[PDB]
CSV table of C-alpha atoms in Angstrom, one decimal:
chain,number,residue,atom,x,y,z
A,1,UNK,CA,-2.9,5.4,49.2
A,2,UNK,CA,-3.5,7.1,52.4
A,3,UNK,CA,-4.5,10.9,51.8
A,4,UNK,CA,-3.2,14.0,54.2
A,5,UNK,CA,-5.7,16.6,54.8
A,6,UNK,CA,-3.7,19.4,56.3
A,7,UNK,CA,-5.6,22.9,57.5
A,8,UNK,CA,-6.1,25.2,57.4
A,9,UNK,CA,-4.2,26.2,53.8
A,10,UNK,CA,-2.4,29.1,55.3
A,11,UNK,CA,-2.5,29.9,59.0
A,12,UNK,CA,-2.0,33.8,60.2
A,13,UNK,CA,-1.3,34.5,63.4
A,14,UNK,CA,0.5,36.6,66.1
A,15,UNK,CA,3.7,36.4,68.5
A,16,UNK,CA,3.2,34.6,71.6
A,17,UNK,CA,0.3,32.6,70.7
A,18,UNK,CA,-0.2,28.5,70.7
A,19,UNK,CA,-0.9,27.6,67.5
A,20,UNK,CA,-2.5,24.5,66.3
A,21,UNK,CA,-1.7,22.9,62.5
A,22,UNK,CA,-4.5,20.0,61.2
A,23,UNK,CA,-3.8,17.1,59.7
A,24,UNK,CA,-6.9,14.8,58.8
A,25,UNK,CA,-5.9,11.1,57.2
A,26,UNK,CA,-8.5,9.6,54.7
A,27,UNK,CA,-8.2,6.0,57.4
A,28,UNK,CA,-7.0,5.2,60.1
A,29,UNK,CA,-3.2,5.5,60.5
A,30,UNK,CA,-2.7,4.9,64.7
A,31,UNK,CA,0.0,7.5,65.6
A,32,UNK,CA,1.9,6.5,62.5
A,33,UNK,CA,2.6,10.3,61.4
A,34,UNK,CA,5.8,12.4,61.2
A,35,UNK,CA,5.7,16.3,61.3
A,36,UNK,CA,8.0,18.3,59.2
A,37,UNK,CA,8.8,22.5,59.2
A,38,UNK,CA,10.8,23.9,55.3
A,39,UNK,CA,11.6,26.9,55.5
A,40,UNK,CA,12.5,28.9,52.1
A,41,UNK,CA,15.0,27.0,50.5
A,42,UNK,CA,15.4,24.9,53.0
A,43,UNK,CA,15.3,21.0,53.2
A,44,UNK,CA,12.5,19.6,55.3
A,45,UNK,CA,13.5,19.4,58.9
A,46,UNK,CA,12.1,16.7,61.1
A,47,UNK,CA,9.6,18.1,64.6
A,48,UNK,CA,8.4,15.0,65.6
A,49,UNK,CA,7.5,11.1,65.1
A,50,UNK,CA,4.9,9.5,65.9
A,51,UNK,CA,2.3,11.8,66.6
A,52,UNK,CA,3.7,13.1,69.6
A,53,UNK,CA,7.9,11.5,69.8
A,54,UNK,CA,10.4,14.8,70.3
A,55,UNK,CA,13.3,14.9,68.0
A,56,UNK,CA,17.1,15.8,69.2
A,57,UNK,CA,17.0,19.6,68.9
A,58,UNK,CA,14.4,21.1,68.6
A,59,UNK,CA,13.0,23.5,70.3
A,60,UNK,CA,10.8,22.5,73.3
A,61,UNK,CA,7.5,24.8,72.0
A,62,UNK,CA,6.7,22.3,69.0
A,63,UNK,CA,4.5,19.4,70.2
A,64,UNK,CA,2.0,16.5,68.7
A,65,UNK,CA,-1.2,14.9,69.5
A,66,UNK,CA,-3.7,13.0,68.0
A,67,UNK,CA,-4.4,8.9,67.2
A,68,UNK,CA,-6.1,7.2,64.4
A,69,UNK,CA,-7.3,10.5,62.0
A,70,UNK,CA,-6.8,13.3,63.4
A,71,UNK,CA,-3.6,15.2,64.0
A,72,UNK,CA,-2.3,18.1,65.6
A,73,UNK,CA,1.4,20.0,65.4
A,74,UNK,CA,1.3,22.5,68.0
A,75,UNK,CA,3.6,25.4,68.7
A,76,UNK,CA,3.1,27.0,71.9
A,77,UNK,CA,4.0,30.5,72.0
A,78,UNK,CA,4.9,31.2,68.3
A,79,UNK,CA,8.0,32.9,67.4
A,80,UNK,CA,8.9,35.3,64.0
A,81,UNK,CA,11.5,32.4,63.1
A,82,UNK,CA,8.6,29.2,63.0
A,83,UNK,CA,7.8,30.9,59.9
A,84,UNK,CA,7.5,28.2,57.3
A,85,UNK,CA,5.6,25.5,55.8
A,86,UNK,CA,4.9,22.8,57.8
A,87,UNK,CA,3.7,19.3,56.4
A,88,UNK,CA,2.8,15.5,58.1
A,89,UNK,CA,3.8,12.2,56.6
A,90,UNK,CA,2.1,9.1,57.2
A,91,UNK,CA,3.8,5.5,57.6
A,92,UNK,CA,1.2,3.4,58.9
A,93,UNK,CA,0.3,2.2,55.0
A,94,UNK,CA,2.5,1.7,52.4
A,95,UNK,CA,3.9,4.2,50.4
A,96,UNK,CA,4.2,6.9,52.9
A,97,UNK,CA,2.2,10.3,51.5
A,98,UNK,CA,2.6,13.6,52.8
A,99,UNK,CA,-0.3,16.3,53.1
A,100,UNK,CA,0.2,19.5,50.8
A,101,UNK,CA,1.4,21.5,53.9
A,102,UNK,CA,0.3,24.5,55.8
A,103,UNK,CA,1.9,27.9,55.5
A,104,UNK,CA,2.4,29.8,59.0
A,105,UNK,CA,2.2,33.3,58.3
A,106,UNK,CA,3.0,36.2,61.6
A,107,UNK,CA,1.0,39.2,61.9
A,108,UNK,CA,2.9,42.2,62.8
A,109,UNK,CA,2.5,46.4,62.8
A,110,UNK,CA,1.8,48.0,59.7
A,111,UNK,CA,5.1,49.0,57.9
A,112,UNK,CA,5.8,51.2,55.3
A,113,UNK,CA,7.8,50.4,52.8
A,114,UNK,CA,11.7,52.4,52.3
A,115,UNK,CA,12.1,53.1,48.5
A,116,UNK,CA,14.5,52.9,46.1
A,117,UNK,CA,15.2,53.7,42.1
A,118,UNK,CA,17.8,51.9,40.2
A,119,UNK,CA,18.7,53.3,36.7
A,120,UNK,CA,19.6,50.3,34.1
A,121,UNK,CA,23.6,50.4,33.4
A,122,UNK,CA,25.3,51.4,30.8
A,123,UNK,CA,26.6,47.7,30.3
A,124,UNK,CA,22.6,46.8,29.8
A,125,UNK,CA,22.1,49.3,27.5
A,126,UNK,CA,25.0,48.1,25.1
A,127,UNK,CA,22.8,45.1,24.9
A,128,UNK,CA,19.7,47.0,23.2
A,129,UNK,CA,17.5,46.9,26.1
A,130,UNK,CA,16.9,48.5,29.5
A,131,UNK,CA,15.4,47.3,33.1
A,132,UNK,CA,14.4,49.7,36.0
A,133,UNK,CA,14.6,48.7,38.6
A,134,UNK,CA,11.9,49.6,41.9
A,135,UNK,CA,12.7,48.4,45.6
A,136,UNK,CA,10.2,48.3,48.4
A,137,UNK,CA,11.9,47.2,51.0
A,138,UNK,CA,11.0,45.7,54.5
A,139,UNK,CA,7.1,46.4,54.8
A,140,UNK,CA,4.3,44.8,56.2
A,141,UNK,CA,1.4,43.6,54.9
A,142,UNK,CA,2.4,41.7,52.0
A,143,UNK,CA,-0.3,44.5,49.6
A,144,UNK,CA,1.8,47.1,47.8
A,145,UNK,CA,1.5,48.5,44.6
A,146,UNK,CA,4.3,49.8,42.1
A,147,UNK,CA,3.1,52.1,39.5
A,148,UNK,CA,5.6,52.7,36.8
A,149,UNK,CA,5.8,56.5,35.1
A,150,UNK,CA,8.0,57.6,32.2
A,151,UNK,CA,7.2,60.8,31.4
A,152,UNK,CA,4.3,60.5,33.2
A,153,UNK,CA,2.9,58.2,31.2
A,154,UNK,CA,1.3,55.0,32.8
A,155,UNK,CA,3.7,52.1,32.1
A,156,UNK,CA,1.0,48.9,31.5
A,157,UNK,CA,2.2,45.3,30.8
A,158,UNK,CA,6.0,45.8,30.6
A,159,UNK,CA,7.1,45.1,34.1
A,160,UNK,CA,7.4,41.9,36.8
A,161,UNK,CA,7.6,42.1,40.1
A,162,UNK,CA,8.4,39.4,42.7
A,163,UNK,CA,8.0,39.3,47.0
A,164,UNK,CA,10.8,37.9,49.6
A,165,UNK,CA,9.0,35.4,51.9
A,166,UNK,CA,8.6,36.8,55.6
A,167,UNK,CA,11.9,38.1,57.1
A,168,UNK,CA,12.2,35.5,59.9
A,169,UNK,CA,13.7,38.5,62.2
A,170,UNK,CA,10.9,41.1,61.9
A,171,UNK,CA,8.4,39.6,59.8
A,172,UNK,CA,8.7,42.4,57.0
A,173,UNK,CA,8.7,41.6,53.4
A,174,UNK,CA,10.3,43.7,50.5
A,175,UNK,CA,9.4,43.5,46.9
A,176,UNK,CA,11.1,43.8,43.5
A,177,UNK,CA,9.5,45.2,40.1
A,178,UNK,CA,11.8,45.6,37.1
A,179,UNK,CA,10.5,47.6,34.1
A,180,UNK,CA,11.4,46.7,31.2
A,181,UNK,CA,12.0,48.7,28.1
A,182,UNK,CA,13.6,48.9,24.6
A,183,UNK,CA,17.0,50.7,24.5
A,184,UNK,CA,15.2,52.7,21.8
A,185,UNK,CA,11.7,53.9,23.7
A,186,UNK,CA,14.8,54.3,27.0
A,187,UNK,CA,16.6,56.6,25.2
A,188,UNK,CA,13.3,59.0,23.9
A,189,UNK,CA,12.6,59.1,27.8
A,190,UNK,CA,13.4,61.7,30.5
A,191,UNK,CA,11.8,61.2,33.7
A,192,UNK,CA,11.7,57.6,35.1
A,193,UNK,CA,9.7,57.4,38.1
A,194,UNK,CA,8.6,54.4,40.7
A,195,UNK,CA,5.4,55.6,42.5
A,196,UNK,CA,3.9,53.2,45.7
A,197,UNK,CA,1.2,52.6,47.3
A,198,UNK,CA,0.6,51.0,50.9
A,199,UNK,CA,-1.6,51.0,53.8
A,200,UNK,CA,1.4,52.4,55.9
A,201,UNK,CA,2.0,55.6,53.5
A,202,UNK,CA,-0.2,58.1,54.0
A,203,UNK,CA,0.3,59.4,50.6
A,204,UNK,CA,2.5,57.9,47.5
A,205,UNK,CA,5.9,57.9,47.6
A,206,UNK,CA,7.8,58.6,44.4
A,207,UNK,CA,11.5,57.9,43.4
A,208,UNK,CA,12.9,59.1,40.1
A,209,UNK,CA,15.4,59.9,38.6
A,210,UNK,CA,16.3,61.9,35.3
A,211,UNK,CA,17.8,59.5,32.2
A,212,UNK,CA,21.7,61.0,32.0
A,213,UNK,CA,21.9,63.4,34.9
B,1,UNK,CA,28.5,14.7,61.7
B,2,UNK,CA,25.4,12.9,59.3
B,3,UNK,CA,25.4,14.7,55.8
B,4,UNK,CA,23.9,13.9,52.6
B,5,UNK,CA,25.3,16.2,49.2
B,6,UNK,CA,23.9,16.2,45.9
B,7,UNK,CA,25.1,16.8,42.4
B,8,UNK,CA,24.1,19.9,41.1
B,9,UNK,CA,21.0,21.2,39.8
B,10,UNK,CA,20.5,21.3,35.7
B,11,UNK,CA,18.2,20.6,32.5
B,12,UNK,CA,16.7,17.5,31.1
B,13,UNK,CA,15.0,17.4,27.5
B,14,UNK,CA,11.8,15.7,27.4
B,15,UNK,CA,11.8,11.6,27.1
B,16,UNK,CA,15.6,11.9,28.2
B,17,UNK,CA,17.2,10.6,31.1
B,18,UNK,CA,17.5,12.1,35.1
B,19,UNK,CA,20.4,11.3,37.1
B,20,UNK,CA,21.5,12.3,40.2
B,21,UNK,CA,24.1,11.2,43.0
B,22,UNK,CA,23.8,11.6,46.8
B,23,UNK,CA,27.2,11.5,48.6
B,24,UNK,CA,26.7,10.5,52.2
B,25,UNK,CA,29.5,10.7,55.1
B,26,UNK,CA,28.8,10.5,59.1
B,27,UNK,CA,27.3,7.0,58.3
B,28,UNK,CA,27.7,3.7,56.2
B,29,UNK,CA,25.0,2.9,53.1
B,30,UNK,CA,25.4,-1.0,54.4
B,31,UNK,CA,24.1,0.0,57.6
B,32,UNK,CA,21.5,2.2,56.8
B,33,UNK,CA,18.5,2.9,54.0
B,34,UNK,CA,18.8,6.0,51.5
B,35,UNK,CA,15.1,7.5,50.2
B,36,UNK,CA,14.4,9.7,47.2
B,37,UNK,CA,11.9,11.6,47.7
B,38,UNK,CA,10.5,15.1,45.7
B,39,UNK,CA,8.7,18.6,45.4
B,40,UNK,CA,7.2,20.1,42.7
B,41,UNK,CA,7.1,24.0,42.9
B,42,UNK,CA,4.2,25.1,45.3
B,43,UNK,CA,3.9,21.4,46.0
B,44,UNK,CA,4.1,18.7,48.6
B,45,UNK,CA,6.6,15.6,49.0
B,46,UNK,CA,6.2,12.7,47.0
B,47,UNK,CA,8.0,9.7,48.3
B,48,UNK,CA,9.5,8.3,45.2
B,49,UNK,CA,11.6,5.1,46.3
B,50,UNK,CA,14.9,3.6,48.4
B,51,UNK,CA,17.6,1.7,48.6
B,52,UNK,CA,18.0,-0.5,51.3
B,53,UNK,CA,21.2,-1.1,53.6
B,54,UNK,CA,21.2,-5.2,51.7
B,55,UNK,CA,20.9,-3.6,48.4
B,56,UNK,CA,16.9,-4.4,48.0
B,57,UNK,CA,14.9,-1.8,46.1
B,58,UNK,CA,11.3,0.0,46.6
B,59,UNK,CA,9.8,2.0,44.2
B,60,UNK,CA,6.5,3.8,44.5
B,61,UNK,CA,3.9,2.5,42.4
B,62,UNK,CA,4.2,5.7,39.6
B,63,UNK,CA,8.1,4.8,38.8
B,64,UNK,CA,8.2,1.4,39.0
B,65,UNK,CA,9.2,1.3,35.6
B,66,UNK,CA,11.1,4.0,35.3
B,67,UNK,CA,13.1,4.6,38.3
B,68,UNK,CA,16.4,2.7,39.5
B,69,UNK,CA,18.2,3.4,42.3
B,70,UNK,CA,21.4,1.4,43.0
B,71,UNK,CA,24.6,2.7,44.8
B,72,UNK,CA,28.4,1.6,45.7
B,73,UNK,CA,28.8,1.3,49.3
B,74,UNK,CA,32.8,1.5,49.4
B,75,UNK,CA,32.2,5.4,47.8
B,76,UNK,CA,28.9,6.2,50.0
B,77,UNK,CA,27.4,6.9,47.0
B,78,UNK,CA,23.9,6.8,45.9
B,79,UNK,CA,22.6,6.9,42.5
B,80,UNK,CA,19.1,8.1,41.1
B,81,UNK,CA,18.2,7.3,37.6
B,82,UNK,CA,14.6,7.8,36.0
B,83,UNK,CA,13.5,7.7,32.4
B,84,UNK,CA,11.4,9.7,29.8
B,85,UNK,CA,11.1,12.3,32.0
B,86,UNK,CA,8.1,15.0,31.2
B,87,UNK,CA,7.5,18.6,32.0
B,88,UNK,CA,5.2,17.3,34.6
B,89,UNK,CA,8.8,15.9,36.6
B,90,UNK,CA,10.3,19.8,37.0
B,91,UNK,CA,11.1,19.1,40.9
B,92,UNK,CA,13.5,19.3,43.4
B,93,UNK,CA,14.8,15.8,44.2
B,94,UNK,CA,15.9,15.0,47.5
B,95,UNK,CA,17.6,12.1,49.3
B,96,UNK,CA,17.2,11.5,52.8
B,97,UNK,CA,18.0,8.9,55.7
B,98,UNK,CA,15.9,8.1,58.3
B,99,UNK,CA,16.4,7.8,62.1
B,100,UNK,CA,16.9,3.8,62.4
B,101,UNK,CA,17.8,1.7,59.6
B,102,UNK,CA,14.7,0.2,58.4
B,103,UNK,CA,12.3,3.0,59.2
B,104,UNK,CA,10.2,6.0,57.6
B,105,UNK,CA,10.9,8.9,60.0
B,106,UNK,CA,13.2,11.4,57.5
B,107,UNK,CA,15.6,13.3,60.6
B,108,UNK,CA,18.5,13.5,57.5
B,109,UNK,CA,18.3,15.8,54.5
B,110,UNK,CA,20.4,16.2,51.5
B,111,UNK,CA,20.3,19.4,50.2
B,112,UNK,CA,17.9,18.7,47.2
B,113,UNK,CA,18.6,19.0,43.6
B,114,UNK,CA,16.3,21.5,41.2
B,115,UNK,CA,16.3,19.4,37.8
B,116,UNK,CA,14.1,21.5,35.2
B,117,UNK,CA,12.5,19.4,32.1
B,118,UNK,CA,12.2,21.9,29.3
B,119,UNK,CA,13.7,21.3,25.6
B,120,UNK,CA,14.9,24.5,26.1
B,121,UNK,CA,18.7,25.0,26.1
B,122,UNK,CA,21.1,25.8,29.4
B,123,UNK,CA,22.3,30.0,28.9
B,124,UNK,CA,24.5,31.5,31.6
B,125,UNK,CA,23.3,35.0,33.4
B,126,UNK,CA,24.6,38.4,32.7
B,127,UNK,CA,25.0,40.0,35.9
B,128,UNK,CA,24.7,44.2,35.7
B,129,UNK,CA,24.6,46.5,38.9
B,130,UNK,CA,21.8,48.1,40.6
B,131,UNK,CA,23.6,51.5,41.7
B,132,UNK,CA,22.8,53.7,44.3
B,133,UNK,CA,23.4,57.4,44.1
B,134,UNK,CA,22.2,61.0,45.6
B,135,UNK,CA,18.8,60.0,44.9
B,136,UNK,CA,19.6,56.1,47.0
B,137,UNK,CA,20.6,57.6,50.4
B,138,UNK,CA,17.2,56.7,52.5
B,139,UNK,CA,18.4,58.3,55.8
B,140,UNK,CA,21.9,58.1,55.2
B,141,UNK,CA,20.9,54.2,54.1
B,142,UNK,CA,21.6,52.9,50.4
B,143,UNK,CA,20.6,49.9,48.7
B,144,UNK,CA,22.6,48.2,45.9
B,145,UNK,CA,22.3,45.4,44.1
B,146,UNK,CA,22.6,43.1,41.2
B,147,UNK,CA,20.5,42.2,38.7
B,148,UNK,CA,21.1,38.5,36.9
B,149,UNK,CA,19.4,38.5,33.9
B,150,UNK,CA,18.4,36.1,30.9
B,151,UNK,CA,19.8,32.7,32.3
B,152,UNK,CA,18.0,28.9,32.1
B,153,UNK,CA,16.9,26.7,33.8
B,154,UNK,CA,17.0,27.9,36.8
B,155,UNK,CA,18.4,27.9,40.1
B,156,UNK,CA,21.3,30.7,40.6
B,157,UNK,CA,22.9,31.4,44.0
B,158,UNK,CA,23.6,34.7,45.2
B,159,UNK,CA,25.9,35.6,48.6
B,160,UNK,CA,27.5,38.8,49.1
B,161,UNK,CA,31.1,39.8,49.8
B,162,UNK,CA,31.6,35.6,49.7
B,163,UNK,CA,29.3,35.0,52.4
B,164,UNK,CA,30.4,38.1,54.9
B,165,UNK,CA,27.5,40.6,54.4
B,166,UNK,CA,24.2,39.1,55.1
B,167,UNK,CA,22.7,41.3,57.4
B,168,UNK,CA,19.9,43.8,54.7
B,169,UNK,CA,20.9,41.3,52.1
B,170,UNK,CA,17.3,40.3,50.4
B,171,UNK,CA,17.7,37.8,47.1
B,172,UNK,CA,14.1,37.7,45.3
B,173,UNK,CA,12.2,35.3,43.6
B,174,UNK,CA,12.9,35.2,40.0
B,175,UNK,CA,10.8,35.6,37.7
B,176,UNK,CA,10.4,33.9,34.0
B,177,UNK,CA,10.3,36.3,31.4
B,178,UNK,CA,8.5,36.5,27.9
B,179,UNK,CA,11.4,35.6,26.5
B,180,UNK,CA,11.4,32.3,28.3
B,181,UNK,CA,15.0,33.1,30.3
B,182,UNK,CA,14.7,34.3,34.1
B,183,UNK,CA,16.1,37.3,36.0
B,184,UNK,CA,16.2,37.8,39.5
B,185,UNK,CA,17.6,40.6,41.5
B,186,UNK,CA,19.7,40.5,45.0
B,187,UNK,CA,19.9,43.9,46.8
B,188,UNK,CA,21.5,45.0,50.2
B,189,UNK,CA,21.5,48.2,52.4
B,190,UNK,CA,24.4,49.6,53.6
B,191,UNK,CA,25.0,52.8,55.1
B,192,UNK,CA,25.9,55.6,52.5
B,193,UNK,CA,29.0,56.7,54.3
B,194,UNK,CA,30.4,53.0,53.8
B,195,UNK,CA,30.2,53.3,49.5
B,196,UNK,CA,33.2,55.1,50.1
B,197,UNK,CA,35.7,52.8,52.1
B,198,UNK,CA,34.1,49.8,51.6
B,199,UNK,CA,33.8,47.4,48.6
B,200,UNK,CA,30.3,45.7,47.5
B,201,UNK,CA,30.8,42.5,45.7
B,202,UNK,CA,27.7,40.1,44.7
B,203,UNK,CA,29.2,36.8,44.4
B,204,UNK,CA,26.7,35.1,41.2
B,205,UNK,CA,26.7,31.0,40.2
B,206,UNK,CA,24.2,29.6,38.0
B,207,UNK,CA,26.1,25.9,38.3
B,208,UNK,CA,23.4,24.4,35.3
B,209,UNK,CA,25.9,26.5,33.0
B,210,UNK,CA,29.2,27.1,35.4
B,211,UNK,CA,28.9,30.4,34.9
B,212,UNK,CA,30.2,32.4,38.1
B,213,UNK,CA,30.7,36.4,38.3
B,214,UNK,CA,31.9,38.4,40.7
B,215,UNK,CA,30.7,41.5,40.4
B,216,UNK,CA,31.3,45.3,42.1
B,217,UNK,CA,28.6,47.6,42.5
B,218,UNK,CA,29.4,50.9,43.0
B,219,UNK,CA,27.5,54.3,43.2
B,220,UNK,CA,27.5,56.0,39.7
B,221,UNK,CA,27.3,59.4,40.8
């Protein structure tokens, strides 16, 4: 089988600029290849064929180049939208292989994140066990860190956290960490607090709230 | 219109069976090929076989014994059907039609199918609120939401108000819990003054175990 080498792994870069996605074939494949953009949770979506071909709708800033092993997807003058992963298919040998993609990733101003604190319900608690919940939304970059206090004690090992993928609009991401804790060591608890970090705050922010009030 | 819709998403034990069925309209299965191809999480595509317009058969060299693809052209449907699946076969599986008939060059997309192979067992979400309150009014913004909690295999869809808010609406990752069972949460921002007059609904469907919720989420206090 024919191998895709696709570079770089993730590329970052900012509005405006012409950017240039590799794709290296282990032999010679002629202009045999097919680009492809998937966004998150999207299908694949077709850019061009055969090497350079344009497809019926899309936008006139993606392009293609290249013959026999090394390929190029260009996108001249990025937008926050092109965010995705993009990936080349070659059908020059049978079976047609894919590379493992490159992630495009757009710089943007440092944002600090807005926060909120979400008490578990009184639903959840029927159920013998309580999640917290700690929103950081729309910030930029993708660093942040959530520190979980009850009591002001250090919470260590009981929470999960998990990150939206770039917001194709203004490139911001927001972030999700649930804490999760025994109806039992809930109800011994007063203060519930959410402390984060980020290169856009020039100190902590804290949200809390007090268990029943 | 070209369209290509798959059955839903769901569990298969290990060594069982996968089937799936991809219902095309806009175009005829005698005139053109159908593909299978699929994506393993964090992963690349992996052409997996096709079906041609005659009714000839390709497999990639890895399922050639345990893939079939056949299909019934007077419903424009397409079935996929592999055997002794593994955990290594956890994937979205998609179908897809090319540009011309005999070719390679995927322009059509169905919109994939998430099959999970676990020996686990299917379990539906419970869906509890993420309520704003005093302490939630970020310059006169709030954020609600809804956490769906404790449900396998995985995907779950969340929209809000059946589609008509999307604007602030982020839906995260979820995330696999010790317990084996995922949760995810969906939140929105709306301004505080609207919590009063207008109602906050996060529409929830985990289709592996039909389970759908609708569910309010209203400030506490």
């Amino acid at each position: 089988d024919i191998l895709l080498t696709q570079s770089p792994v993730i590329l970052s870069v900012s509005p405006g600029e012409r950017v240039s996605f590799s794709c290296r074939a282990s032999q010679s494949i002629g202009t045999n290849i097919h680009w492809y953009q998937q966004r998150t949770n999207g299908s694949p979506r077709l850019l061009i064929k055969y090497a350079s071909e344009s497809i019926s709708g899309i936008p006139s800033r993606f392009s293609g180049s290249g013959s026999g092993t090394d390929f190029t997807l260009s996108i001249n003058s990025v937008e926050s939208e092109d965010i995705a992963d993009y990936y080349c298919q070659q059908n020059n040998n049978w079976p047609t292989t894919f590379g493992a993609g490159t992630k495009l990733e757009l710089k943007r101003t440092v944002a600090a994140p807005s926060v909120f604190i979400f008490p578990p319900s009184d639903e959840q608690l029927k159920s013998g066990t309580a999640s917290v919940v700690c929103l950081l939304n729309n910030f930029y970059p993708r660093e942040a860190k959530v520190q979980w206090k009850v009591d002001n004690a250090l919470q260590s090992g009981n929470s999960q956290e998990s990150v939206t993928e770039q917001d194709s609009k203004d490139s911001t991401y927001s972030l999700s960490s649930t804490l999760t804790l025994s109806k039992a060591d809930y109800e011994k608890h007063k203060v519930y607090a959410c402390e984060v970090t980020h290169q856009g705050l020039s100190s902590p922010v804290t949200k809390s709230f007090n268990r029943g009030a | 219109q070209v369209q290509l819709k798959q059955s839903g998403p769901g569990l298969v034990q290990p060594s069982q069976s996968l089937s799936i069925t991809c219902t095309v309209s806009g175009f005829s299965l005698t005139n053109y090929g159908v593909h299978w191809v699929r994506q393993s999480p964090g992963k690349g595509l992996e052409w997996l076989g096709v079906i041609w317009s005659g009714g000839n058969t390709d497999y990639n060299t890895p399922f050639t014994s345990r893939l079939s693809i056949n299909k019934d052209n007077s419903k424009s449907q397409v079935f996929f059907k592999m055997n002794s699946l593994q955990s290594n076969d956890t994937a979205i599986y998609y179908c897809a039609r090319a540009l011309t008939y005999y070719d390679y060059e995927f322009a059509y997309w169905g919109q994939g199918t998430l099959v999970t192979v676990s020996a686990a067992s299917t379990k539906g979400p419970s869906v509890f609120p993420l309520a704003p309150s005093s302490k939630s009014t970020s310059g006169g913004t709030a954020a609600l939401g809804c956490l769906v909690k404790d449900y396998f295999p995985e995907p779950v869809t969340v929209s809000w108000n059946s589609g008509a808010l999307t604007s602030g609406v982020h839906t995260f990752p979820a995330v696999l819990q010790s317990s084996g069972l995922y949760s995810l949460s969906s939140v929105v921002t709306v301004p505080s003054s609207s919590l009063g007059t207008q109602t906050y609904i996060c529409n929830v469907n985990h289709k592996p175990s039909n389970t759908k919720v609708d569910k309010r989420v209203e400030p506490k206090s």
